[PDB]
Amino acid sequence: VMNTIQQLMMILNSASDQPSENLISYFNNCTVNPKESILKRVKDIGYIFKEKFAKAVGQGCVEIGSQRYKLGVRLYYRVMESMLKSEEERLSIQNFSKLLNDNIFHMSLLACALEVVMATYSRSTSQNLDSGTDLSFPWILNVLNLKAFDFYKVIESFIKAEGNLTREMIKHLERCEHRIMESLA
């Protein structure tokens, strides 16, 4: 008895698939409104992710792959919002058109959100379960085709932005960081 779920996954499980009203407010406050492109990338990548998940995972776990993608997308919106708030407090600016219309910030942020979920192995990569396959780093970088160094650029702030991140998840992301470092020089 006694739930083993941890806080962030708990929050995530009950989160919504769409960006919050508060988040949409940040979109509407931009010189060039990022909504359309942001929703398109999420949807376009949702497909690459699912076909890749299937190709690495195998027969009918499609349900799994979809939920894994959903959880990552939710953390992504949760963290974007979170960074926006802290940046507005830091700069006293509320129009983040450049940041939000930037593909890399988005690809980077989404990869990291999906990385934390994929490393969490939500229900848990096991010796039998569906997605008992380990799909942690550099998996995501390859599925989104994202530069290791770009991915690296979002880590620190993703961690600063996500307080409900477990210590094991923080050490994971710091590990990916270390690895990308040694892959640099």
Domain range list for the chain:
1-185
Alpha carbons within 13 angstroms on the beta-carbon side of residue 85 total: 13
Give me the DSSP letters along 76-140. Answer: HHHHHHHHHHHHHHHHS----HHHHT-HHHHHHHHHHHHHHHHHHTTT---SSSTT-S---TTHH
Cβ neighbours around 172 below 10 Å, total: 19
- Crossing angle (nearest 10°) for helices 103-120 and 35-57: 40
DSSP 8-class letter at 3: -
- Experimentally, the structure was elucidated by X-ray
If phi over 0 gives left and psi between -120 and 50 gives alpha, with beta otherwise, what is residue 3?
beta
Counted residue by residue, the chain has a size of: 185
Residue 96 burial (C-beta neighbours within 10 Å; 0-12, 13-18, 19+): buried
CATH class for the domain made up of 1-185: mainly alpha
Q: Three-state SS string across 32-94, please? A: CCCHHHHHHHHHHHHHHHHHHHHHHHCCCCHHHHHHHHHHHHHHHHHHHHHHHHHHHHHHCCC
DSSP 8-class letter at 14: T
CA angle 111, 126, 8 (to 5 degrees): 45
Q: Is residue 161 within 8 Å of 82, Cβ to Cβ?
A: yes
